[PDB]
């Protein structure tokens, strides 16, 4: 229950609500909906503040295994790219699980995503 109030937090930037769940005891790697992670909604639309949060705790920055894809690319096709920046600042390599050179190459054509290709 409260599954919405929990995910609805990584959506509207209610960083205050997700801070309550992790305030429990490091829990940033639970199947959010049924096969995703609490970093896709934060990256795609976490006011760029939510992603850094639940990420500094554990590290779903790479955990993704069945998603065959890491969240840094989630922001790529989002136009936010404000996170992908302070993101690699933690490591997140650059191509730890994408298909291949897709990352910024086959992803788009703007100089912002290509910025992560620098």
From Swiss-Prot:
Gene Ontology terms: biological process: catecholamine metabolic process; cellular response to mechanical stimulus; cerebellar granule cell differentiation; neuron differentiation; positive regulation of cardiac muscle hypertrophy; positive regulation of cell growth; positive regulation of macromolecule biosynthetic process; positive regulation of NF-kappaB transcription factor activity
Xref: Pfam families: Ank_2
Single GO molecular function: sequence-specific DNA binding
Mapped ANK repeat ranges: 2-30, 34-66, 67-99
Residues modified as N-acetylcysteine: 2
Intracellular or extracellular location(s): Cytoplasm; Nucleus; Cytoplasm, Perinuclear region
Assembly, per entry: Interacts with the heterodimer formed by CAPZA1 and CAPZB. Interacts with RELA.
Listed name of the protein: Myotrophin
Species classification: Eukaryota, Metazoa, Chordata, Craniata, Vertebrata
Gene designation: Mtpn
